[PDB]
Design a protein around this ligand. Structure first.
Ligand SMILES: CC(=O)CC(=O)SCCNC(=O)CCNC(=O)[C@H](O)C(C)(C)COP(=O)(O)OP(=O)(O)OC[C@H]1O[C@@H](n2cnc3c(N)ncnc32)[C@H](O)[C@@H]1OP(=O)(O)O
Ligand SMILES: CC(=O)CC(=O)SCCNC(=O)CCNC(=O)[C@H](O)C(C)(C)COP(=O)(O)OP(=O)(O)OC[C@H]1O[C@@H](n2cnc3c(N)ncnc32)[C@H](O)[C@@H]1OP(=O)(O)O
Lengths: 290, 288, 288, 290, 285, 285
């Protein structure tokens, strides 16, 4: 028995709504700024579940049972008696502080405020609030990845970290406590990997398929690092590298100028059909250095 | 085809099985003492008897593998070798005079390759009469499918192709690398371990947590702290210091935490304590 | 001598007492609102009444000090000023147009000085008709004996000497500085605080311990963590980021720990919590 | 009631011997490699105490009472039933590992092994030993400075840190626990100060007396940073900077090339009569830039 | 061919000279304030007068090229070269304001020093290319030809031919910060400034060192004053911000001098004070 | 004056030429293997022959200077210039072995590229000074005069006069890593190598870029091959180790080529392969 409000209806918010609604006994309020943005979010969840039922990987009764626990709307209307708030709205500081300042008046006092952000300070987002702000960081696709990073901020009490811990296990996830530093644990290790694999390309050491092949056969990684960057989106890798550099001031985390030149040109990876690989119609991918 | 493997230690052992696994090849497993090489082949043959009893290899395929390997001294066994893969102690002067000696023994068409991970292929073969290429296996060499082929600054393109063709002819996937510090795998993978240690050092997360986050967040088979324990923190410290010294770039500065643990003998699995304590059962316990 | 002090805040207050303390000087304490400047002088006069009751100043020396200071607007009080010390909000465009306005008011021989710590003296006075020098007091300006005199890239040697002579004429010790980021004191002293924080961040010692070690090991009056609390961690973060941005050098990267505490409002004494909790008695407690 | 053996009879060892022998109830074995090196150490302690009695700052009975508790000799002869060993021998790794490997056989099992080193790893010094090695770091003059840094190594148990804690209070010092990192607490903060004050000189920002005057009047420090470097010895500042750089790999701790050029020329500060200041006969010091 | 130059400063003026001195080309010269865009064409006749006087040019040739330059015109050019201020939104906006104004099929080229070509041309209808001239653009034989990720080869090659058509040498260079010449030459100026700042030598010694020790036509500090110390700071900063590498941090002595307006030859005081005698004096005497 | 040069390589040979070509000086040329120290004087007559053939020198002048050079002699010189290998203990030992051999009052000078002068002369009886020539020492007009902390002015000035006496220009420079010219010029070669390594351009383009874009007599990569890529690596490494600043990290492509013995003109293959035709080919074609 839990009510969960999810502020943001793009990719992350829809997956976070699905992660709670998969557990029987949870109802999800899928909110956004315009009521029609939330409705497009719930239709996107529905459309996506129609594909799996087709590909035979989920039963239609389950899909229906998931969709039935999600309600689109506005936070003023749906988040009063919410037990947990998980925001996955746009990565802008002032938008977050506004959202949470409103919800602070809307929500009952018992409500837990959490943010899925990966680029901003949990500490600075929840500064003015009347209650603890915590980080509850999901990984795309949030309904299938079992990791949750629980980020403590400078003032986030330990009970608040402990509660998000219990909730993550309740929904079948594995929490990992992180004290707020840029990149947390997973992003701080993983994106500098992608960045090194790009320096190795830029410096002429090896080719794209070779760097990826070496990482797949040499370390038993599921993808190559450059494959992976296309699939994450090179724009997001660049932004994480730049966040890792600006927070620390450490030249160690400088982004590879090759990534920046591709993002400038719009070659963001799988989402643009072209990054280090070209994604064609016939389901084949070829590295851009051929 | 006849291959000479210089070094009867673990790597040399694994490289000899890789070539002897394949029908039609012969391997001379050499080391600096006739006995060393004969102990190398005895470790190989008993690893094969555990496999036979485990039922995962025919008793006659294993015998035919052991039969294809001959221990001895290079002065006796490598003159009509077609390919030499060196896998001996990582010291630049020991590798240079081993390849100086082999330059006089081995027939001209014999190809010279070194399994080195941390020394410069180019420097290795500076003064020789024939090209020197990198042929960097991954342990266990008989089981890992990747082979990094390292072109030196004067290693002709023809030499690099023929080592590619040999790697596939023994069932590997060659990835051509133009020599730089760390090649591909080590240059990505060891700074990874190093970063997880800085995360531990700086109080961001705990050892178990850093490792759980990378396997459940990034789909990695091992956490980076378990893996640096499995590779050996001494191997990880040394690769970091190579990257640092070959580049000049503070980016590759090793994490002082790893340097403190290596100074105390806490190297990982090989000493029974690193980031994890490895107990008498099978569990491992984070020192956290 | 007649001095104009631009800014009736704490620094401007402390700089006006420094000049009015000395017999024969007059000070115009100006700010952008007539009331602000009159509140500045009222804070000054009541600080002097606590001193009189504490018996540490004659009742007539204090009255004569307060009498030498006149609040108002610069357009009214600074035209026949001999020296202008600006001490207003640290924003480059606010300082440039304040000195543009004063360039038309003040008689030509009036000397223009700014108390800025983080902005470029040279940029401050780029387009003016007269030189612009740094005259950087230390709070409390009336009590600290040091004055850093900052030569700009176009500040003549004659201007620098005359500010030296004024500093001693009001009983200070001038230390000539050729403009660079941090001058002398801030460039040594704030990286100090920053380093003690990295030591805390990296788990080397504890907050009380870092502070006790520096006072009993180096003969320092305050620990560096107490001192960053007393200066304000926001002031310390900002100086770090100036040093970093003016140099380009990772050496002066601020410690992320200090950046996290500033984002949470834990700035030190001014907010009642930083590295120390400051309780209702007089004790302070390390957040450690 | 405590017996203390001090391995090293130069400056540090003599001051460490004096710090324990000042406390009634402690007897000090002042050891070195050649019996005559320890005797010169005890005569140096005696000569130095004859000066204070002259300058009127200590009573002669006290000096005599201190000297009487110090015995020069060889560790084989004097350190068997020692309660604590504090080595302040030369800063060389192999010398330390040899000294401690011998003392490990000499000393009773109850004996605490400690090292005053400031440049080497406590962890690497006591690796092969049969008992914990700890760092007990004194500050010249060890008999008058109240700070002791107690350094835990990678394997130094907490009881061993706790015991050196009690002993430091017993002798009137204030211990500070430090987990082993280069420079500990005091040196990592202080010498990079001296180094910055030297960059400021080298870059032409201010003059020698001005940098020192600013630091004395601006921060209320007892000395200027350049004054202080002369008094510490610029060779030692250089070595600490170089140790801080090599251990971290961080360009942040690069030594100022001005310090290195003065050390090369032999201008080590007060001990050579010339560093940033020239130390004349008539008790006056003038900065070398005049 | 018709050619429009955007910017009327040293480089704008020199790029205009470079096109108009080849028989057959016509140039449109432009700037913000028109009085500055005629001040441009004014500095062009003034210099051609001093050379015809010195016998280096025939008056009729000097008069044939200053008649091919029109201060404005851009509606009909076959090629646009912007030599505007080295600020990114400054270049997007101009080029933004410019995709309307020019004929549909006319080539857009920027003379930027180190900025990404690819970001410069993002909202445009047509490919954007890099065509980099070197001070003085009318004498220096080099053109660096920089193509962005979305720059076709027909345009890269159409620039190579135009280059050889006006007596230049076009070297093609891939898009990275500083391209070739500035990435090498500007840190060299920056280093010489650190050498003066740390007192290793004086301004005079460093410059004659590199002239007599390296056979360089200018010392690195005279060369900074001639380039403009504000352009040098910019490129250093762009170098530093593109790579993230403290290797390229500008020398604080150059940031101090740009803040004071000691920019070199354009303001009469850089590392040298330039006198009417035509003699320059190092500011450290 | 009598002059002894220590080292018989390019710089040793050129420094010998620089003294002997001035009427009145005599030089003693030296090296490890004597066959190398006559190989030195062999490369000196061979080059003077090719110039007399090309009419640049009169045979009698070529014959007057090769008669002032004696392969050895050092016992009586008034001035010693070492141009030995750029390894510190290599220079201390030589100079160590040399304070005995030379006359008591003779001036000791090192042609080191970046090493501290002050540490070079520590155990010596006499001041040690820096007298830095530039390849080719007989043409390049510059001498950098470097004094150590314990080098008196009489010796610094005695070098300045000797310099002007052999038609050079002596610039005095304070002891820091790289002095002036190499601290600027060598990272410039190093940068051009990073530019080739990151693929921004090819070897040819970078060099003609800097010739046509900067008016440089050699491109930075030809200049590396002419200096020797082993000397360039050394100076970069010394730069990096003296400052501690990753700004000066050598480019790994130059460390790889030195490891392979691709040193430039002295080994026939650097960034260019040098052919008997007298044409050089970039190794990337
Ligand atoms: C920052 C960026 O983005 C790109 C950049 O700009 S980086 C900087 C690139 N530019 C440079 O580095 C400049 C390098 N410096 C040089 O090449 C030389 O300094 C230099 C060519 C400018 C030297 O000046 P110079 O040789 O005296 O001028 P130059 O025109 O070549 O020859 C001088 C002659 O102008 C000659 N001349 C003949 N015709 C001429 C003409 N049409 N126009 C001008 N001059 C002419 C005359 O012969 C005059 O010499 P005399 O008085 O002795 O007769
Ligand atoms: C690393 C360190 O520690 C210090 C260093 O060395 S750093 C590197 C410093 N050195 C440099 O940078 C070199 C810079 N490069 C240059 O200055 C030019 O490359 C260069 C002078 C070498 C160009 O070569 P050049 O101009 O062709 O040779 P140069 O001798 O000056 O003139 C060529 C002429 O030799 C001339 N010549 C006349 N007399 C001569 C003589 N006594 N000796 C030699 N050449 C003579 C001839 O005129 C020949 O030219 P022609 O065939 O056209 O008639």
């Amino acid at each position: 028995a839990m009510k969960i409000g999810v502020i943001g209806a793009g990719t992350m918010g829809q997956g976070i709504a699905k992660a709670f609604a998969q557990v029987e006994g949870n109802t999800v309020a899928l909110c956004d700024i315009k009521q029609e943005w939330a409705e497009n979010g719930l239709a996107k969840i529905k459309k996506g579940y129609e594909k799996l039922v087709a590909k035979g990987k989920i039963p239609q009764e389950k899909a229906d049972a998931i969709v039935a626990a999600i309600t689109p709307g506005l936070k003023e209307n749906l988040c009063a008696d919410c037990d947990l708030i998980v925001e996955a709205a746009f990565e802008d500081m002032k938008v977050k502080q506004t959202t949470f300042g409103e919800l602070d008046k809307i929500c009952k006092p018992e409500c837990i405020f959490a943010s899925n952000t990966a680029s901003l300070s949990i500490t600075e987002i929840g500064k003015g609030l009347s209650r603890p702000l915590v980080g509850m960081h999901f990984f795309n696709p949030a309904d299938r990845m079992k990791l949750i990073e629980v980020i403590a901020g400078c003032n986030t009490p330990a009970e608040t970290v402990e509660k998000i811990k219990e909730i993550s296990v309740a929904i079948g996830k594995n929490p990992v406590q992180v004290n707020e530093a840029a990149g947390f644990v997973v992003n701080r290790i993983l994106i500098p990997m992608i960045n090194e694999a790009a320096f190795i390309k830029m410096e002429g050491v090896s080719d794209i398929a070779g760097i990826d092949t070496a990482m797949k056969l040499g370390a038993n990684h599921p993808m190559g690092p450059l494959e992976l960057g296309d699939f994450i989106g090179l724009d997001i890798c660049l932004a994480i590298m730049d966040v890792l550099y600006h927070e620390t001031g450490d030249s160690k985390y400088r982004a590879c100028p090759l990534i920046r030149k591709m993002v400038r040109g719009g070659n963001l990876g799988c989402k643009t059909g072209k990054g280090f690989y070209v994604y064609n119609a016939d389901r084949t991918k070829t590295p851009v250095d051929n």
